[PDB]
Amino acid sequence: MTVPSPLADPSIVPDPYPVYADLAQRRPVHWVERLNAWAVLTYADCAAGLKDPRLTADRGTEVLAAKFPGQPLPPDNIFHRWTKNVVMYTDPPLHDALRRSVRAGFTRAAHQHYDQVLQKVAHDLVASIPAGATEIDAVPALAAELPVRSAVHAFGVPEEDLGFLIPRVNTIMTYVTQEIILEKLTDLHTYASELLQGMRGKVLPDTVIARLAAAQDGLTETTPEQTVHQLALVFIALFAPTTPGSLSSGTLAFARNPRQVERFLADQACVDNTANEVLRYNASNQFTWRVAAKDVEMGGVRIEAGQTLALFLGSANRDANMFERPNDFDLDRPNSARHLSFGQGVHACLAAQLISLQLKWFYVALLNRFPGIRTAGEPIWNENLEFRSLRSLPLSLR
Numbered sequence: 001m002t003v004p005s006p007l008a009d010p011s012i013v014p015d016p017y018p019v020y021a022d023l024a025q026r027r028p029v030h031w032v033e034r035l036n037a038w039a040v041l042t043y044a045d046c047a048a049g050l051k052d053p054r055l056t057a058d059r060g061t062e063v064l065a066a067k068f069p070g071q072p073l074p075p076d077n078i079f080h081r082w083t084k085n086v087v088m089y090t091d092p093p094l095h096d097a098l099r100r101s102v103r104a105g106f107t108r109a110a111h112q113h114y115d116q117v118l119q120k121v122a123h124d125l126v127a128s129i130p131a132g133a134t135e136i137d138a139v140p141a142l143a144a145e146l147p148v149r150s151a152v153h154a155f156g157v158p159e160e161d162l163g164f165l166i167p168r169v170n171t172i173m174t175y176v177t178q179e180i181i182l183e184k185l186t187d188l189h190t191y192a193s194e195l196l197q198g199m200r201g202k203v204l205p206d207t208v209i210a211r212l213a214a215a216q217d218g219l220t221e222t223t224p225e226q227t228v229h230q231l232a233l234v235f236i237a238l239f240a241p242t243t244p245g246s247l248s249s250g251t252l253a254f255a256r257n258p259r260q261v262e263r264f265l266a267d268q269a270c271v272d273n274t275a276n277e278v279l280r281y282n283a284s285n286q287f288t289w290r291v292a293a294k295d296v297e298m299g300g301v302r303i304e305a306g307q308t309l310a311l312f313l314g315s316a317n318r319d320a321n322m323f324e325r326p327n328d329f330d331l332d333r334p335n336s337a338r339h340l341s342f343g344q345g346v347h348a349c350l351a352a353q354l355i356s357l358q359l360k361w362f363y364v365a366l367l368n369r370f371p372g373i374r375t376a377g378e379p380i381w382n383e384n385l386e387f388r389s390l391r392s393l394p395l396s397l398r
């Protein structure tokens, strides 16, 4: 518990992969004092961790009370009420009722619709770059924008309410006091309940939110108050840096791998594999958290009940045991769907197919219009490994 580890250090964020690979061979499970947690680096251990019912997702407190040390919250506090009433931070059986209660947004029919919507939104965004522009900053120009367009057109966040929502989510997601974070989370609840009453903006028809709103008369195993808590989670997830990071990191991968641009243009199987290879290549959420509900042993280490674990999805995704030549961006890779960037099992990302559709249709539009993308200077990363995202991606278009 006293052995130094570089895993919480912003210095590794530009390229964490060699650090992960070095430490994995030596100390695949080890203590990271700045995370107050056991790091778990290998694919096999992360996948087992995500499936292990000895590891609870009820971890909101452990993980906040880390970020704002000695800052003990009264109960009734909204963070506790929220975490206890959303899928992300609950265990079965309640988790499962919570997840079923949002199914209407995510049916097979719904995704057939979102496929069409996202094709068009991505096409239109890329088309709005003038053909003769020679350079862009792909982060603000594209990766920041497509998730917002998706939030409006596929999820049904009213356009007119983005000024309310995005800055609040950005404040929540900051790498700003505990009080402020609870204020913004309170505001997201107020917004969610008012949105469903018709007091905020207009929800577009056939969107995720319209479907969830139409499902409310039929609740059987969850409450109206839990719908409000879960919609506050959805807003955070929608405007989190996760989707921008996926879009930008994958754009960088294509810019540095012209041969894969060629493969994408040549072969529909490579197009179909693009979202998963992009997701594997750089997990936006490079680690997720668990608490040990019972003692477990992983990587030779006895982890005691109550201790926190950080499951390094980003490391897992570049484990050569699972992915031969893991550091190659390879659209021909046969098992890219085994990545852990959306988790696995009980908590696997609710939006996984929505996100893969967004990614696919973005790269279809981008590489058809601007096959010659290349970096125009060194990319600049952020400093937060947990939600890792490019800050700037200067790109030459031709």
Ligand code: HEM
Residues within 6 Å of the ligand: 087, 088, 089, 099, 233, 234, 237, 238, 242, 243, 246, 283, 284, 285, 288, 289, 313, 340, 341, 342, 343, 344, 346, 347, 348, 349, 350, 351, 352, 355
């Ligand atoms: C590239 C973008 C995204 C990435 C990389 C991502 C990643 C993840 C990961 C890693 C998990 C599992 C967490 C764990 O097991 O601890 C997860 C869960 C979840 N994601 Fe996403 N996500 C993204 C976008 C979104 C969006 C836009 C939404 C909006 C609905 C969303 C909603 C959720 C929800 C609700 C859960 C919890 C599901 C449950 O607990 O049953 N995600 N996501």
Ligand SMILES: N[C@@H](Cc1c[nH]c2ccccc12)C(=O)O
Residues within 6 Å of the ligand: 063, 088, 236, 237, 240, 242, 285, 287, 288, 289
């Ligand atoms: N990894 C986060 C959960 C998470 C996954 N995807 C997200 C998107 C936004 C916010 C949180 C998340 C946690 O352990 O707390």
